[PDB]
């Protein structure tokens, strides 16, 4: 690739918080949070509300509402 | 008032809040007094005829 | 200077605290009673320990920028869900069921005759 034209690119771990499922891939989201990975190096983490392993269409199961959500507050009521 | 509307007011309402008062002499829905079950117009006419006990023109 | 915002120096502490976004009269009095400080003492004639206690009490009240972000997030959520309140926020009209035939200036801006 040419130098100085492309946006900054780096490895990141997308973490589906619903299932606490982590997947490594490149992106340019540059989250401050850092986490360790099975390889010795550590890369920043991108929080993700819904993912392939959590979406109902992909999974075949009903999705689980997250904490502090609308459903949780409604049930607390 | 409409005969159907008077009949519907008289009939029992599935709701309870759905009950409203109509003048029982002419059927006007507005301005019906509770003590007489009359609208203002019928009240005036009957007070003039003297057929509402103890009701007379007021002044002070 | 509390919560990252300066407050009038010559104003009594209870009133001067209301200048903090998210702090009104009632919360100002509650904070002042929790962190024991004279009601009538002006902020200029105030002690560093009192100021520190006031800061400690204030930091946990979720005021200023965090409060603004929360309100904006609520408004954005109701706009995004396509609610009636969201549509009225988008159109800049009263949201709480007022009558717009007249008297909707605070939401509609100045009169465009």
């Amino acid at each position: 690739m040419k130098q100085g034209i492309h946006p900054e690119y780096h490895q990141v771990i997308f973490l589906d918080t619903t299932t606490n499922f982590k997947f490594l891939s490149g992106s340019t989201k540059t989250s401050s949070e850092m986490m360790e990975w099975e390889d010795g190096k550590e890369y920043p983490v991108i929080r993700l509300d819904i993912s392939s392993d959590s979406h109902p269409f992909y999974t075949g199961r009903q999705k689980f509402a997250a904490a502090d959500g609308r459903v949780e507050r409604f049930n607390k009521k | 008032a409409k005969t159907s509307m008077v009949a519907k007011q008289q009939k029992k309402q599935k709701y309870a809040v759905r009950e409203y008062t109509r003048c029982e002499r002419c059927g006007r829905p507005h301005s019906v007094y509770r003590k007489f079950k009359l609208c203002r117009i019928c009240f005036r006419e009957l007070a003039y005829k003297g057929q509402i006990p103890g009701v007379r023109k007021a002044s002070w | 200077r509390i919560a990252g915002v300066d407050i009038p120096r010559e104003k009594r502490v209870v009133i001067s605290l209301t200048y903090i976004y998210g702090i009104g009269t009632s919360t100002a009095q509650k904070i002042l009673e929790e962190a024991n400080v004279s009601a009538d003492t002006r902020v200029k004639d105030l002690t560093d320990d009192e100021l520190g206690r006031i800061r400690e009490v204030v930091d946990g009240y979720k005021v200023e920028g965090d409060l603004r972000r929360e309100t904006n997030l609520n408004i954005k959520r109701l706009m995004e869900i396509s609610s009636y309140r969201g549509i009225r926020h988008r159109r800049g009209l009263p949201v709480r069921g007022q009558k717009t035939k007249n008297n909707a200036r605070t939401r509609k801006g100045p009169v465009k005759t």
Binding site: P7, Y9, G26, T28, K29, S52, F57, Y58 | - | -
Partner: protein, 176 residues
């Protein structure tokens, strides 16, 4: 390169066994991914095209090529040479990263998602997916999105048939 490793290990073997390829060189692979955004309203406001280019660059990771009108059209008020689109070509590791990201992080963010069209094959082993909201992609913050616009993602494969392309994309994890 998790997706590339999956292709090398599992998808290769599955597809080869399914289609009875005498040689490994017959195993289809995803040649490239072209992400195109056609901005016809750039005629009226070039700032729209600039924002579209910025968003596409954020999504893809590399600067897009600006595509200009091939011919002049009176009805669209389009003059030859006016920039009316953006396009990015992804190959190799960047392509695989974008593909897995699209499959996992991006696609489920579609409201009322029910899978992607299984008939969206050109007839020769290439698949075109029409996304209708840039906001799908994780790298974009809705605050900075002045306008919402879609994209065409063309996955160009070496498969000679729609059947083989479908098998390859399914093994990769494409919903349908």
């Amino acid at each position: 390169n998790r997706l590339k490793e999956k292709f090398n290990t599992e998808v290769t073997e599955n597809l080869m066994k399914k289609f009875n390829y005498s040689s490994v060189m017959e195993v289809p692979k995803i040649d490239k991914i072209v992400v195109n955004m056609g901005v016809g309203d750039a005629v009226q406001n070039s700032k729209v095209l600039d924002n579209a280019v910025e968003e596409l660059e954020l999504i893809t990771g590399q600067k897009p090529l600006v595509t200009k009108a091939k011919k002049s059209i009176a009805t669209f008020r389009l003059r030859e040479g006016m920039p009316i689109g953006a396009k990015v070509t992804l190959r190799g590791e960047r392509m695989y990263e974008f593909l897995d990201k699209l499959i996992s992080v991006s696609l489920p963010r579609v409201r009322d998602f029910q899978g992607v069209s299984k008939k969206a094959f050109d007839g020769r082993g290439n698949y075109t997916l029409g996304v209708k909201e840039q906001l799908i992609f994780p790298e974009i913050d809705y605050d900075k999105v002045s306008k919402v616009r879609g994209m065409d993602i063309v996955i160009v494969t070496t498969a000679n048939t729609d059947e083989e392309a479908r098998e390859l994309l399914a093994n990769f994890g494409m919903p349908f």
